[PDB]
Amino acid sequence: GSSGSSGLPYGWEEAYTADGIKYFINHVTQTTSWIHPVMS
């Protein structure tokens, strides 16, 4: 799988904090969680 991270499902959005860490947040559910919602 050439790619892995890039390619999240419609609705989710991976952002970063002022420190650098990365987290996953949804817009439809407006929920903050740390995971990789992706299936191959």
mmCIF file of N, CA and C in Angstrom:
data_model
loop_
_atom_site.group_PDB
_atom_site.id
_atom_site.type_symbol
_atom_site.label_atom_id
_atom_site.label_comp_id
_atom_site.label_asym_id
_atom_site.label_seq_id
_atom_site.Cartn_x
_atom_site.Cartn_y
_atom_site.Cartn_z
ATOM 1 N N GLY A 1 0.806 -1.206 0.000
ATOM 2 C CA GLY A 1 0.000 0.000 0.000
ATOM 3 C C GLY A 1 0.843 1.260 0.000
ATOM 4 N N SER A 2 1.240 1.705 -1.188
ATOM 5 C CA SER A 2 2.060 2.904 -1.321
ATOM 6 C C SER A 2 1.661 3.951 -0.286
ATOM 7 N N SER A 3 0.370 4.258 -0.231
ATOM 8 C CA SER A 3 -0.143 5.247 0.710
ATOM 9 C C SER A 3 -0.779 4.567 1.920
ATOM 10 N N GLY A 4 -0.934 5.323 3.003
ATOM 11 C CA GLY A 4 -1.528 4.777 4.209
ATOM 12 C C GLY A 4 -2.337 5.807 4.973
ATOM 13 N N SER A 5 -1.660 6.836 5.473
ATOM 14 C CA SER A 5 -2.323 7.890 6.232
ATOM 15 C C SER A 5 -3.220 8.729 5.329
ATOM 16 N N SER A 6 -2.616 9.361 4.328
ATOM 17 C CA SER A 6 -3.359 10.198 3.393
ATOM 18 C C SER A 6 -4.492 9.412 2.740
ATOM 19 N N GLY A 7 -5.718 9.895 2.917
ATOM 20 C CA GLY A 7 -6.869 9.225 2.340
ATOM 21 C C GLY A 7 -7.919 8.881 3.376
ATOM 22 N N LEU A 8 -8.270 9.856 4.208
ATOM 23 C CA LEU A 8 -9.269 9.650 5.251
ATOM 24 C C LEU A 8 -10.678 9.669 4.666
ATOM 25 N N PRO A 9 -11.622 9.034 5.376
ATOM 26 C CA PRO A 9 -13.022 8.966 4.949
ATOM 27 C C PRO A 9 -13.724 10.317 5.041
ATOM 28 N N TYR A 10 -14.657 10.557 4.128
ATOM 29 C CA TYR A 10 -15.399 11.812 4.105
ATOM 30 C C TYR A 10 -16.056 12.081 5.456
ATOM 31 N N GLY A 11 -15.697 13.205 6.068
ATOM 32 C CA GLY A 11 -16.261 13.561 7.357
ATOM 33 C C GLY A 11 -15.197 13.762 8.418
ATOM 34 N N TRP A 12 -14.144 12.954 8.359
ATOM 35 C CA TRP A 12 -13.055 13.046 9.325
ATOM 36 C C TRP A 12 -11.987 14.024 8.849
ATOM 37 N N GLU A 13 -11.196 14.534 9.788
ATOM 38 C CA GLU A 13 -10.136 15.481 9.462
ATOM 39 C C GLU A 13 -8.991 15.383 10.466
ATOM 40 N N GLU A 14 -7.798 15.081 9.965
ATOM 41 C CA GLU A 14 -6.622 14.956 10.819
ATOM 42 C C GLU A 14 -5.880 16.285 10.922
ATOM 43 N N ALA A 15 -5.813 16.826 12.134
ATOM 44 C CA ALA A 15 -5.132 18.094 12.369
ATOM 45 C C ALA A 15 -3.998 17.929 13.374
ATOM 46 N N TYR A 16 -3.297 19.023 13.652
ATOM 47 C CA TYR A 16 -2.185 18.999 14.595
ATOM 48 C C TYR A 16 -2.312 20.125 15.617
ATOM 49 N N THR A 17 -1.695 19.933 16.779
ATOM 50 C CA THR A 17 -1.738 20.930 17.841
ATOM 51 C C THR A 17 -0.535 21.863 17.768
ATOM 52 N N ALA A 18 -0.527 22.879 18.625
ATOM 53 C CA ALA A 18 0.567 23.842 18.659
ATOM 54 C C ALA A 18 1.889 23.158 18.988
ATOM 55 N N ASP A 19 1.805 21.952 19.539
ATOM 56 C CA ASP A 19 2.996 21.192 19.902
ATOM 57 C C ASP A 19 3.512 20.389 18.712
ATOM 58 N N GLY A 20 2.591 19.778 17.972
ATOM 59 C CA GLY A 20 2.972 18.987 16.817
ATOM 60 C C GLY A 20 2.160 17.713 16.693
ATOM 61 N N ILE A 21 1.669 17.214 17.823
ATOM 62 C CA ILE A 21 0.873 15.994 17.835
ATOM 63 C C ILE A 21 -0.251 16.059 16.806
ATOM 64 N N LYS A 22 -0.740 14.894 16.396
ATOM 65 C CA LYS A 22 -1.818 14.817 15.418
ATOM 66 C C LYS A 22 -3.012 14.055 15.983
ATOM 67 N N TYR A 23 -4.211 14.545 15.691
ATOM 68 C CA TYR A 23 -5.434 13.910 16.171
ATOM 69 C C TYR A 23 -6.495 13.873 15.076
ATOM 70 N N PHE A 24 -7.481 12.998 15.245
ATOM 71 C CA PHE A 24 -8.558 12.863 14.272
ATOM 72 C C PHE A 24 -9.860 13.441 14.817
ATOM 73 N N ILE A 25 -10.456 14.357 14.061
ATOM 74 C CA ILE A 25 -11.706 14.988 14.468
ATOM 75 C C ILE A 25 -12.745 14.919 13.353
ATOM 76 N N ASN A 26 -13.996 14.680 13.732
ATOM 77 C CA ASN A 26 -15.084 14.591 12.765
ATOM 78 C C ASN A 26 -15.900 15.879 12.745
ATOM 79 N N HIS A 27 -16.517 16.165 11.602
ATOM 80 C CA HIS A 27 -17.329 17.367 11.452
ATOM 81 C C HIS A 27 -18.813 17.040 11.593
ATOM 82 N N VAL A 28 -19.191 15.836 11.175
ATOM 83 C CA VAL A 28 -20.580 15.400 11.254
ATOM 84 C C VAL A 28 -20.962 15.037 12.685
ATOM 85 N N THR A 29 -20.002 14.494 13.428
ATOM 86 C CA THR A 29 -20.237 14.100 14.812
ATOM 87 C C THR A 29 -19.519 15.036 15.777
ATOM 88 N N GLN A 30 -18.732 15.956 15.229
ATOM 89 C CA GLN A 30 -17.989 16.909 16.045
ATOM 90 C C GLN A 30 -17.374 16.225 17.260
ATOM 91 N N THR A 31 -16.656 15.133 17.019
ATOM 92 C CA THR A 31 -16.017 14.385 18.094
ATOM 93 C C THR A 31 -14.506 14.321 17.897
ATOM 94 N N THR A 32 -13.766 14.414 18.997
ATOM 95 C CA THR A 32 -12.311 14.367 18.945
ATOM 96 C C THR A 32 -11.786 13.021 19.430
ATOM 97 N N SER A 33 -11.080 12.314 18.552
ATOM 98 C CA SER A 33 -10.525 11.009 18.891
ATOM 99 C C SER A 33 -9.214 10.767 18.149
ATOM 100 N N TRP A 34 -8.392 9.875 18.689
ATOM 101 C CA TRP A 34 -7.107 9.553 18.080
ATOM 102 C C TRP A 34 -7.132 8.159 17.461
ATOM 103 N N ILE A 35 -7.417 8.098 16.164
ATOM 104 C CA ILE A 35 -7.471 6.827 15.455
ATOM 105 C C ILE A 35 -7.366 7.033 13.948
ATOM 106 N N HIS A 36 -7.280 5.932 13.209
ATOM 107 C CA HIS A 36 -7.178 5.992 11.755
ATOM 108 C C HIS A 36 -8.324 5.228 11.098
ATOM 109 N N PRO A 37 -9.486 5.887 10.981
ATOM 110 C CA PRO A 37 -10.678 5.289 10.373
ATOM 111 C C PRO A 37 -10.525 5.095 8.868
ATOM 112 N N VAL A 38 -9.832 4.029 8.482
ATOM 113 C CA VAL A 38 -9.616 3.728 7.072
ATOM 114 C C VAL A 38 -9.614 2.224 6.823
ATOM 115 N N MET A 39 -10.238 1.810 5.726
ATOM 116 C CA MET A 39 -10.307 0.397 5.373
ATOM 117 C C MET A 39 -9.791 0.164 3.957
ATOM 118 N N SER A 40 -9.153 -0.983 3.744
ATOM 119 C CA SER A 40 -8.610 -1.324 2.435
ATOM 120 C C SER A 40 -9.223 -2.618 1.912
#
